[PDB]
């Protein structure tokens, strides 16, 4: 019985193989077969390459291997092209990801070097992306041992804390497979990925090939960088930070958390962006003052500006969902100099009606009756705080899983009057994911979050000041087909106020866009960021 | 008697003035005098410009002002050049900085616009740099009021919480000065900065002109973004983060804090870098496990790699001082792919002697006898923790202020045997700055920090593995003339191991480089970052 899987980097987790080059260089440059790729191996265990793979010398020290050849011949150039062409073998990583999800201890065992080239970042980025998905990364140059030497396999077994018979070992080199096999490990010679995965599938008894498209990488709260900024005495804002590049500020809706962006955080960071996933004022680890006025759009926007000020950021791309989407449009209208680009999921931009009170506007639409239920302080707090597990299980559901109506809420006397005491677990969320929201809401409750709805008149007066303005900065509107509150049609006239507005649309998607359709959200956002936000 | 100072942005805190352009455009393009600059003012209070300055419309909406002129004529281009040429009037900001340090309430009052141009970041950066140095920033487009209207001055007075006679008002426009003067405020017509400062000097009774060069901007701990990363169960690393751009990781020495970089943090962020000022393992808000082995170079370096991994950073420029400088050279030798560039202040790179034990090496040099005193667990902790204020006041001193010898420490039985109970406050530190270090050291004490010295044999064995390597990545060595422990001569042979090594040297500088000579440190580091780290 097996509980561990070991993968080689080159020719297994990363394709094309490092030595696929050479074979290609010799052929292309019409050089004698094997000359290059044998001069590279010169001296064997006492040679320059073994010293490099053991970490005795760096790649730049090794470049002068050194060793008729033409004028336009460079080992540096051949190796730069080879390392840069090498991309993650996605089906292989997907299989490793599946085995780990199924309880396996996963590891990368590779014959690698200490890269000190000017272009070393390319490989550093690749290793950073791969290493996060595995329990261990064993590099020859770090341990001072190499494949095929028997010592590295005994080291591998020690790190895994497993007997040889409990381990699968995948490698593209037969010589490096042999010591694993002779110790009693299950081995796979990797030629084409498909047959290697068929062999891995048969041995583990787990479906790896032709499996449904997996969900994007999520976040483990304890493995994140948590940031804290005091925006004013007694008001501190919490955020989760990941990646380098242009700052992308993610703003959640009601009754959410930074965790609502769990599928977007790794994806956007990987796309070349510095992600700042907020816990909005009144939520999670951010401060939750009791006063209603502390949650009016003007104060919330001013505090987001202070957040940028204190972090030393002149600009950030503002991506919002729900109430976050609303704030995000107001950041673009009142502080365009601080907004690099603006994007909203579900929340349209509707200019304020100066001739109609917001209470008149809300009463005119029956979908918005829950907003009137949210007006009286204490009422909705009591219902929502009564049973936190019930609250999140009832709300966080796909379009087909609906349990709550949202209509006639005030007349019925609550959101959960037609709802079960023990709602079933939605396909979008795990029990553990629900419990995270439960734990975050135990700190401050629903007073702060609900206060976002208690400034209708205040927000209306402030928004009326921007009635003569137009949003001329890069903007994106993402509509969700099955959002029965924030309907795609509500966005129809936005081009009148945002002429250069770009659009995205997600079919079979409910209100909880980020967790309902994570892959589609990431795809739309990355495409727009790369084209409009740099 | 005065306690408040108000400055205009244009033609006062920022030069050249916005309208210096036009006068220059008309002249250069041989257009009728005033045509441009009057068509701009068309309609007066009901005109397009007043609507813009009140925040009714954006700058891009205003561009089509609109209004024989040539083919190669563009208001967008004229305004882009004008805004980009405008730089901070450093002597004016320096004067504002002096008044605020002397107890004054400072404010910026400006007739400005909502900038939504593609090049809006330039101005956003300028405002971000200026606003941090003032109590208030009053923008016409945010308040819906403009200069010269009497309402903005009553608003100014309200925000300042001061009577007119307590306020100095500086402006380059006579019309906008008049309402402040007629209310009873002291006013200054700003033409040339020197006479304006002479007038400001006479009225306040504070020296503003020809004052000694001020210290760089420092950090107020409560105004910083504090980050926290768990590198392994029970080990969390704390850092202060400021700025955008390439990640610059600052590593302090013994017995320091992230705060030792207080003068570098704002400067490097302003230079276009993302500063991550660490609380090294065993210090401040970072975890301090008791075990000695937790502080060996191999573990500390591995944890710094995990820190980059969890933050989603493939690379960071590593700048270290003292023990931080040592770690930083080992990051370059063992993880070159994760180090964009490497810089050390005072700490030279000396390869390990494989034929001599580190205890033999330490005994051979009498300057290093304190390291032998630091060996026995509990001994140095007791002396250093006895009186924290005394510990920091005795250590943090300039080359001329020496109170401790560091020689014959073991024979004398301590670092402070020749030291006073109440040492005088060094010129480098304030009482408040000393108290910050006192408060940070109250959490974990000196066990963790001292354990950095308790791995001599372990560190020696690990360093011996890198003896065949060379540092080929961008590197900088900064020597301090009067550091009597980390002498500039100790660095003499570094070119043998780091061939492309760049150098910096600071005269009349002791061991505490960052606080001794902050201006010179910032200048050397920024110059090197911009040339070698991108
Ligand atoms: O959070 C809900 C919600 C979301 C909004 C909203 C308010 C303003 C703008 C956008 C959305 N209002 N209400 C969805 C589930 C139950 C209430
Ligand atoms: O912190 C001190 C110190 C600094 C170092 C050091 C150790 C290793 C490398 C560089 C410096 N060893 N000791 C300076 C004041 C009292 C001790």
Secondary-structure topology with pairs:
The structure is a homodimer of 534-residue chains.
Chain A: E1 4-7, E2 14-15, H1 20-28, H2 48-53, H3 59-62, H4 75-85, E3 87-88, H5 90-101, E4 105-110, H6 121-131, E5 136-139, H7 140-143, H8 150-160, E6 167-171, H9 174-183, E7 186-189, H10 193-204, E8 225-232, E9 235-242, E10 247-251, H11 264-270, E11 274-279, H12 297-311, E12 316-321, H13 323-334, E13 339-345, H14 358-364, H15 369-373, H16 379-386, H17 388-395, H18 409-412, H19 431-444, H20 447-451, H21 456-463, E14 475-480, E15 502-506, H22 513-516, H23 518-533
Parallel strand pairs in A: 1-4, 1-6, 4-5, 6-7, 10-11, 10-12, 12-13, 13-14, 14-15
Antiparallel strand pairs in A: 2-3, 8-9, 9-11
Helix pairs in contact in A: 12-13, 17-19
Active site (chains A, B): 322, 453, 511
Binding site for Mg(2+) (chains A, B): 8, 10, 172
Lipidation (S-(15-deoxy-Delta12,14-prostaglandin J2-9-yl)cysteine) (chains A, B): 509
């Amino acid at each position: 019985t097996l509980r561990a899987a070991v993968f080689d980097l080159d020719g297994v987790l990363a394709l094309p193989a490092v030595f696929g080059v050479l074979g290609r260089t010799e052929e292309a440059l019409a050089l004698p077969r094997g000359l290059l790729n044998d001069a590279f191996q010169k001296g064997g265990p006492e040679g320059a390459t073994t010293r490099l793979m053991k970490g005795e010398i760096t790649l730049s020290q090794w470049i002068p291997l050194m060793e008729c050849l033409p004028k336009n011949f460079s080992i540096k150039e051949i190796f730069d092209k080879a390392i840069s062409a090498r991309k993650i073998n996605r089906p292989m990583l997907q299989a490793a990801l599946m085995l780990r999800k199924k309880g396996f201890t996963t590891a990368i065992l590779t014959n690698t070097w200490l890269d000190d080239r000017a272009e070393r970042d390319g490989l550093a980025q690749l290793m950073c992306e791969l290493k996060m998905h595995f329990d261990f990364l064993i590099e020859s140059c770090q341990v001072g041992m190499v494949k095929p030497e028997p010592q590295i396999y005994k080291f591998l077994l020690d790190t895994l804390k497993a007997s040889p018979s409990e381990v699968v070992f995948l490698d593209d080199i037969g010589a490096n497979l042999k010591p694993a096999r002779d110790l009693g490990m299950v081995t796979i010679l990797v030629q084409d990925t498909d047959t290697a995965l068929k062999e891995l599938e048969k041995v583990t008894g787990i479906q790896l090939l032709n499996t449904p498209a997996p969900l994007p990488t999520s976040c483990n709260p304890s493995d994140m960088s948590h940031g804290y900024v005091t925006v004013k005495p007694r008001v501190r804002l919490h955020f989760v930070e990941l990646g380098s590049g242009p700052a992308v500020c993610l703003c959640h809706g009601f009754p959410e958390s930074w965790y609502s962006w769990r599928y977007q955080i790794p994806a956007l960071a990987q796309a070349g962006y510095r992600v700042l996933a907020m816990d909005m004022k009144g939520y999670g680890e951010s401060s939750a003052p009791p006063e209603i006025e502390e949650y009016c759009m003007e104060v919330l926007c001013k505090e987001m500006v202070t957040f940028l000020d204190k972090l030393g950021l002149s600009q950030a791309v503002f991506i919002g969902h729900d109430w976050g989407g609303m704030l995000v449009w107001y950041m673009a209208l009142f502080y365009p100099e601080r907004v690099r680009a603006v994007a909203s999921l579900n929340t349209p931009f509707i200019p304020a009606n100066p001739n109609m009170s917001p209470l008149e506007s809300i009463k005119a639409n029956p979908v918005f009756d829950y907003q009137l239920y949210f007006q009286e302080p204490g009422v909705a707090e009591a219902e929502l705080e009564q049973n936190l597990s019930r609250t999140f299980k009832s709300l966080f559901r796909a379009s087909d899983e609906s349990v709550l109506s949202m209509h006639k809420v005030c007349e019925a006397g609550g959101l959960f009057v037609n709802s079960p005491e023990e709602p079933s677990l939605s396909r979008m969320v795990t029990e553990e994911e629900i419990q995270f929201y439960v734990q975050q809401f135990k700190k401050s409750g629903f007073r702060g979050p609900l206060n976002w709805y208690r400034n209708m008149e205040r927000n209306w007066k402030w928004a009326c000041k921007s009635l003569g303005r137009k949003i001329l900065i890069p903007a994106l509107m993402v509509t969700a087909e099955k959002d029965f509150v924030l309907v795609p049609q509500m966005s129809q006239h936005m081009e009148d106020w945002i002429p250069h507005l770009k659009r995205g649309h997600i079919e079979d998607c409910g209100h909880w866009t980020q967790m309902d359709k994570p892959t589609e959200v990431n795809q739309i956002l990355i495409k727009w960021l790369d084209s409009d936000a740099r």
